[PDB]
């Protein structure tokens, strides 16, 4: 009812010996319920790869071509600016803010949906109609490559052959300096170039999503307000006798009993869903943020 489940993602679904596949805009969905940003970004990645299983893999596309992934952790935390790789060989397993990693020709739409408010991204102009976070819009701020444990005295090794044949699509802009093809919304926000700062904003993840005001309307006893009219007799427009904020507040919880508790859960209740890429180092199980906002319903 409140339009917070269904959206578009523009996933690549064709293999034509690559050169030019058709991208084919389509609409996604997710089942309704009482969700939290830790548990939802587990299953909103499931909503992406749900249409991978009956159009993507039934066409012939490569396994490591999942277009839109909703990530939580910051890349380039162990990355020193002198050596263009990340130093410990693994991206830091700790979530800061939920963002979006993408591929070429692969956006995400937020026109008729309200998941952007409950993921933690908005515009800086709330009055323009609709926006698509396309590729080449978050320009600057590629995810870097990595270094392996072996042969590090002697070579630098941006190699991509380790995750069971999944290719990282690493890039070489500068000689001996290495980036990849993926582009995150966090690294494109604090980028040295910019151009995403001018139209996007960081905010609280906001599990409510900023619900609209709830109007009271009662024609049969109250005289109308200053500019309203009696005769419309519609369920849409009525003489409003008062507004207030929709009674759906947030309860906070925070712990040092964080993301390690998620590792204890997936050892139990034996489960391979939500975790179709356990060893990709990009499409892994994303870390929970250290605080979860629980949405309750106080009587107003």
């Amino acid at each position: 009812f409140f339009n917070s489940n269904s959206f578009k993602a523009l996933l690549m679904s064709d293999k034509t010996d690559p050169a030019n596949p058709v991208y084919t805009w389509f609409e996604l969905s997710i089942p309704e319920g009482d969700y939290t940003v830790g548990s939802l970004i587990d299953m909103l990645n499931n909503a992406v790869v749900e249409n991978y299983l009956e159009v993507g893999r039934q066409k012939g596309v490569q396994i490591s071509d999942i277009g839109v992934k909703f990530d939580t952790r910051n890349f380039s935390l162990g990355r020193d600016p002198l050596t263009s790789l990340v130093t410990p060989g693994n991206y830091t397993f700790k979530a800061f803010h939920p963002d979006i990693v993408l591929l070429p020709g692969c956006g995400v739409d937020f026109t008729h949906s309200r998941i952007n408010n409950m993921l933690g991204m908005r515009k800086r102009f709330p009055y323009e109609p609709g926006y698509v976070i396309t590729y080449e819009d978050l320009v600057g701020g590629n995810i870097p490559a990595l270094l392996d444990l072996a042969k590090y005295p002697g070579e630098t090794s941006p190699v991509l052959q380790d995750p069971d044949g999944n290719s990282y699509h690493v890039e070489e802009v500068s000689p001996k300096k290495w980036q990849t093809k993926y582009r995150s919304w966090c690294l494109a926000y604090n980028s040295s170039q910019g151009t995403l700062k001018s139209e996007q904003i960081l905010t609280v993840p906001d599990i409510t999503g900023g619900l609209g005001q709830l109007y009271w309307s009662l024609p049969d006893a109250f005289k109308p307000p200053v500019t309203f009219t009696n005769n419309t007799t519609d369920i849409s427009t009525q003489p409003v006798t008062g507004m207030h904020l929709f009674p759906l507040s947030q309860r906070i919880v925070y712990n040092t009993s964080a993301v390690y508790a998620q590792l204890v859960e997936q050892m139990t209740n034996n489960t391979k869903v939500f975790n179709r890429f356990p060893k990709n180092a990009i499409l892994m199980q994303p870390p929970y943020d250290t605080t979860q906002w629980i949405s309750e319903n106080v009587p107003y």
Partner: protein, 50 residues
Amino acid sequence: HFADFVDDRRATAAGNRPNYIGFRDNFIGMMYYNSGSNTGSFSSQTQQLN
């Protein structure tokens, strides 16, 4: 329709019952009278009272 059916050969037939379907006398039921749910209004403008 069939009035008695045994085999595809031997079966009697009878026409369907005549079912005249039209509007009511005086077009009753076209309009919501006697309603607080669907109440039509003849209200003046500027003094909007019903």
